[PDB]
Amino acid sequence: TRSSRAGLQFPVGRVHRLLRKGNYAERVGAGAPVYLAAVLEYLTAEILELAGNAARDNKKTRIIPRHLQLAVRNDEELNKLLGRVTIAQGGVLPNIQSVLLPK
């Protein structure tokens, strides 16, 4: 398939059909689905690697949404990317202000 012919993992014909039904332009270039597939593949690779690091931190084998939330919340700019976004079984990080603890 053209996926291999571009050296990617994503479904090029399927995603092109997605773009077609998208109703965004009458016609489009051929490499555009390749390009978007590549960037999405990069992003998913990054986020899954961070989640795997998190799973190492809590010493687990599978992947939990809480791991995802911890990973994203640890990095400031990634959070900025997912600003107004929230996640099922998200949770929040342990964050306590200085004066809150007793003395």
Binding site: T86, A88, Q89, G90, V92, P94, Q97, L100
Partner: protein
């Protein structure tokens, strides 16, 4: 033995930040959903996925408001919450008209 004020609060705060779960059992929340739903039309069968997402979203939104008020109280040099805090928080959020 009786514990000094604050210990329970901080311990539960820590355990909840460790925790990841809903803190409202379903049935009252569902019943509230049902009694508010028909206020536009009767006989609406509900999706469990729908209602669960509703619960989660409500919880997330209100938690956000909680931290809002916590920052307010920090700004207040006070360690107790009170309504004008949430009023300011809502105003600055701008969700209220």
């Amino acid at each position: 033995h009786r514990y000094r004020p604050g210990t329970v609060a901080l311990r539960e705060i820590r355990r909840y930040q460790k925790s990841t779960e809903l803190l409202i059992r379903k049935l009252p929340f569902q019943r509230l959903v049902r009694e508010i739903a028909q206020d536009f039309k009767t006989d609406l069968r509900f999706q469990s996925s729908a209602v669960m997402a509703l619960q989660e979203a409500s919880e997330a939104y209100l938690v956000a408001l909680f931290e809002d008020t916590n920052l307010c109280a920090i700004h207040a040099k006070r360690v107790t919450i009170m309504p004008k805090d949430i009023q300011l928080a809502r105003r600055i959020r701008g969700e209220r008209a």
